[PDB]
Paper text:
Milano is a contractile tail bacteriophage that infects the pathogenic plant bacterium Agrobacterium tumefaciens, an important tool that is widely used in genetic manipulations of plants. The contractile tail of Agrobacterium tumefaciens bacteriophage Milano is flexible and bent to varying degrees, which sets it apart from other contractile tail-like systems. A contractile sheath and rigid tube assembly is a widespread apparatus used by bacteriophages, tailocins, and the bacterial type VI secretion system to penetrate cell membranes. In this mechanism, contraction of an external sheath powers the motion of an inner tube through the membrane.
The structure of the tube in the contracted tail has long been assumed to be similar or identical to that in the extended tail. However, this has never been established experimentally. However, the tube and the contracted sheath have different helical symmetries. During 3D reconstruction, we removed the sheath contribution by an iterative, three-dimensional masking procedure while applying the helical symmetry of the tube. This approach led to a tail tube reconstruction in the contracted state. The structures of individual tail tube subunits in the extended and contracted states could be superimposed with an RMSD of ~0.7 Å between 127 pruned Cα atoms. If we compare a stack of three hexamers in the tube rather than individual subunits, there is an RMSD of ~1.6 Å. This analysis shows that the overall structure of individual subunits and the tube as a whole are indeed the same in the extended and contracted states, as had previously been assumed. Notably, the tube straightens after contraction, suggesting that it becomes rigid and suitable for cell-membrane piercing. In the contracted tail, the tube no longer interacts with the sheath, and the tube’s surface charges repel each other and straighten the tube.
Residue numbers in the entry:
A (entry chain I), B (entry chain I), C (entry chain I), D (entry chain I), E (entry chain I), F (entry chain I), ...: 3 to 129
The structure:
């Protein structure tokens, strides 16, 4: 009742990079039991000798598999439009992503798409 | 009755790149339960630092596995002829592909072919 | 009775590349349920930007796994001799390959060989 | 949606150096993911002792790889005609080059040309 | 009762690399049956000829999969903060890691994170 | 079907510089996926200060890699005879080269030769 | 009774490359149901354009997994000694290999070794 | 937490060599994981016989790759303006460069520029 | 009773490479059913044309997975100390390894370590 | 069977330049898959302005990599003796070279030598 | 345990060429697996005809890549100060270099410097 | 067993050019799989017009990479002493070099040295 590891709402606000047409927020449903993966830290460390690391700038990757909404063209899930993802988990965790961009669009069978979203920062409510 | 994830008709119009002989449209049947994958967006983004991406021009890939029609030579499914694919799913989604070209022909056992179609754009009816 | 996906006769005519000794045609039996794969088109397209492709010349690959005939030395199935393969499927499809050459000979346990045949063209009866 | 590193329009206006026939502007497409390189400064400094430099006059080099337009002869991309390049990037950056001249024409396979353009100045919109 | 191969307490003390805010120690729970892997030796040998090796300096890698604590932001598990890990196994083995740094942050579904910790030395109680 | 970047026919007419024996036209096949490079402009510009160039007379270089025809001696591909190359691409582009001369003959393994052809002008059909 | 695909006798004659001590022939037993793979042809063809191949000289590889004989040191199965393998299958096929050399010795658990034997020629009785 | 090899702030103060318009300081972001290289010593020794060297006066080179700020024209990164670079690394190292001058401007794709800065001296905080 | 393929005693004598503290011999237990792999030959042959090989000097690799002894620090199993391994199998085979060195230390969960030992020679009792 | 790009026999007749001792013909084997390169034309053209060339006298270079025959001293492959090379390819092409001279002897590991042969003319059978 | 190819201690004593301030000895750590290269001989021979050489005086070059110590300014590693390097390898080899001078200072990213040290002589302990 | 391309013994006899102290012969081990290159001919031909060559006197270069013997100072491998190299390969080839001289000493990491030996003649046993 308090210890449920799962997503509850995926509110995505699409905006076309060219026409700047804001479509959203539109709730989405997961296609399977796999949960969206996150990476909040924007600095990717690398391994060096004797415990040293190289703090290099990187992105806040977010892999969000969702069922494509029939009202939304499939192109918007594959880099053709910016995504403003707002995922709230069952345990209260809410992470708002703003001005994301699908970097590596992979083939989708028309219903279940998988986004590899990239943004400068990923917020977190942390209940 | 409204929530069926599957293809209904695959109307492909083959035209030989050399002789310009238009053969089609010819309905095709799926060889298994795997559905055709799509990628409508023609711009493939790439991951860069701190949320930036590089909008690079690319193609609208479409992987369409179909049962080869006995009336059509197998060469037409392996780059020897342009394909005009018109796939209509069970939920009303219809995506017309025009002037495609099989880029990476793989070996087919004579019945089940798998096309990796490449076109400048993939339309979508989006019911 | 008309919709059987399988091979019926594999008539291979071996000729030694050096001695020019034509041995064949000799019917062959499949070692398992895997069917011979084909690629009739001799031009392998490659993916480029926004729907363009590069028509490059290539070969008509044919992967034919057969049970090695005890009357034929195993070397003939591994590039030591040209193969003239003539495969007729159960649905009437007959594809004649002439002057092939096994390009990548892999190890065979003495009974089941797998040829990766390469020829300039693969004909097709197409019933 | 605002942080896309890529070109959007490449409007080139060719004019033959001899006949003074102005052909253009004609939008061009990039052949790959490599972006056009620029050098706005027309004074190339050189390294000297203890922090001093020699301000020497030079050109505003611009390396612009584009897909050759079928309506335009390939000679115009290889020094035979002046180019008036007008590149607008995805982030609003627009740089107008006037009266350029391809200085080092390299071999092109007929589709993808690479110009090494030289002009006295390269403007910049700088959004 | 003495021969139990498993972890008992994972006391991690996070400190932000930027703000130097020390949060911890906070006990953590394993997400599955996989145990944390260790490598105490900071010199990674390499294979050479006839039994010789090249003693090269390296790090004391420690792969620690833990359930992310809801009180701690997920960024701290992905390189955004130094980790002071103190793992005590069931058989008395206690290994204190100080001033570690997650080098390769991978995507986590919000509950189960996997750290690839790097430190100059890994102590060991060795009961 | 219209956007194929590749060569279709390479009709070369060899004539011996000494005996004036015209052998050709003889169609040739490409040895790999690399396409013939061209340079139609016969004036090679050079970079000077502040946007100026030096229009200097040069040649219309054409690098044409072809499979040597067994009926033709290999010497004819290495400067021993004038070449009249007539390459027609898949997109309709046809460029006729007359009275060329291989300037830098490089070693060929007996099958795949690479000509560095030099002529005063390279025509272009430009469909 | 005539159609048994399996090995019957593996008579290997080891001779040390240094001391020239000929130990053998010693019959060997297979460790599992996997049969020795062979490749009699000493010329490995490679795929080229439009049906052409490059006849390149190679070896007659033979992968022979056998149970190591307790009377023979394990080093002899891992390149330390030449092997004269003489395998006779159940269907009468007998292939004599002379002056072989294990090229890639892999780790063996002390009982089941796997040799990757290389020889200039592999004979065949071919009943 | 103390052993991070990376840059934190790159405060560059541009001033136009002609108009003397001081623009800055403006923080910059690295385009990749490559760190700015430095050379503090202004005397470049040269190798001579038997351990002797020739102390010759030189510059304090600094190669600083940064993401070009959209508010700043690209010319300022390519010698058109003096740069006052102030780089502070993650380990406390801060090196102030004053009155630098980009000596060898190379082509930049509009976002990621690479400066080869030359100054009489490079200071160092050395924590 | 005579045909048991398994290890009986693994007597390892650790000596620290730095302090030269000889700890051992200490019997070890296998963590699973996988047996230690060996390679006695110190010359690794490589495949060449038509049956020739290149005798190149190499090491006598030995992969020994053992349960780490609680009295021994885990670092000694990961290159921090030389190992003198003495494995006696159930069938009488005893192979003494002297002055080994773990070359590629991999992560161990604290109980089951896997050594990739390298030594100039591996002896063998060969009952 | 007719389209094999490879060498079959390399009959080289060595004669010492000093002692005039004719040793040969001795068949040679290729050390790898690289084929001998040829250049039959003895006149090397050079590029000039507007399609003109300078017919300059040169040699008929032939790069022939062969496995050194143990009966022949290695010096004969490195300029110490004249070579009379007679290479016959698999497709019938036979090119006889007479009174050649290795001009640039490079280091050979004792087995695989590479000759850069120079002769006034290279004949060709041209089947 | 005796056959470890690697460095153990790099004791460098810096002294400023101008102020004569002796800072050191300060132990240094290698930044990667590359070992310091040496050249003890101070006479560099040159190749002449028929086995003769020209004994010419030169230096004892030593390329020593080390991690720059935070207590030492980076200028001292780039010719601004004399270095007294004392490297002791793992196998007992200790080579003392006195009054060296970095001749060719290259750019360092602030942590890993590479010195090209030049001295009249390089001693060697040679255990 | 007879076709092993590799070295077996490298007996080098060092003698100091100054003190005339003969140290050797001392067997050496190869550091990797690269074999010593040789050039027996002492006359280096050069390419001239129409098949003529210029017989010019040169040296018998021998590149011998060996593991430096700990009993021998590293200077002896870098021109400080004459080398009397005696390499015997696995196939019986033995080449004695007398009064050699390392001409171009390159940096060695203390274990693996590479000599560029020059002598008036290189003998050969030629089994």
């Amino acid at each position: 009742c308090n210890k449920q590891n799962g997503v509850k709402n995926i509110l995505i606000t699409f905006t076309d990079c060219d026409t700047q047409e804001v479509i959203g927020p539109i709730s989405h449903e997961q296609p399977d039991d796999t949960l969206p993966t996150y990476k909040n830290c924007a600095w990717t460390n690398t391994a060096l000798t004797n415990g040293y690391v190289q703090r290099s700038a990187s992105n806040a990757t977010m892999t969000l598999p969702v069922v494509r909404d029939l009202r939304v063209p499939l192109a918007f899930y594959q880099g053709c439009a910016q995504v403003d993802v707002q995922v709230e988990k069952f345990d209260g965790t809410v992470m708002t992503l703003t001005e994301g961009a699908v970097v590596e669009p992979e083939e989708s069978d028309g219903r279940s798409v998988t986004m590899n979203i990239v943004a400068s920062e990923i917020d977190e409510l942390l209940p």
